[PDB]
Amino acid sequence: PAKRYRITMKNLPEGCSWQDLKDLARENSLETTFSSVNTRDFDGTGALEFPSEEILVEALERLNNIEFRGSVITVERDDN
């Protein structure tokens, strides 16, 4: 729509899953459309999408190098 973006949500010790990352994201105030998770990286990173950069910039300032129930995630723009 007004936008289309994709972000990475990742760090190193955590093979996170879509259920896990949406759980945290709702904790944190994200929602998004969806995320590319479970497939491969070091083992398991997510990569979210939304039609409006509000949600992108949010996580880039809400989830960037945050501790995730005892793991951590670093998050960033990945198609922009």
Give the domain CATH number at 16.
3.30.70.330
In the sheet with 46-50, reading across from the earlier edge strand, the strands are 34-35, 46-50, 5-10, 71-77, 66-68
Query: What domain range includes position 64?
Result: 1-80
Q: Which 8-state DSSP code applies to residue 3?
A: -
* Residues making up the chain, counted from first to last: 80
Question: Looking at beta carbons, which pairs linking 60-65 to residues 24 or more positions away fall under 8 Å?
Answer: 60/7, 62/28, 62/29, 62/30, 63/9, 63/24, 63/25, 63/28, 63/30, 65/11
* Residue 70: other Cβ atoms inside 10 A: 7
Cβ–Cβ < 8 Å for 63, 56: no
DSSP 13-69: S----HHHHHHHHHHHT---SEE--SS-SSS--EEEEESSHHHHHHHHHHTTTEEEB
Q: Cα-flanking dihedrals φ and ψ of residue 32, to 5°?
A: 55, -175
Residues 6+ apart with CB under 8 A from 43: 15
Structural domains in the chain (count): 1
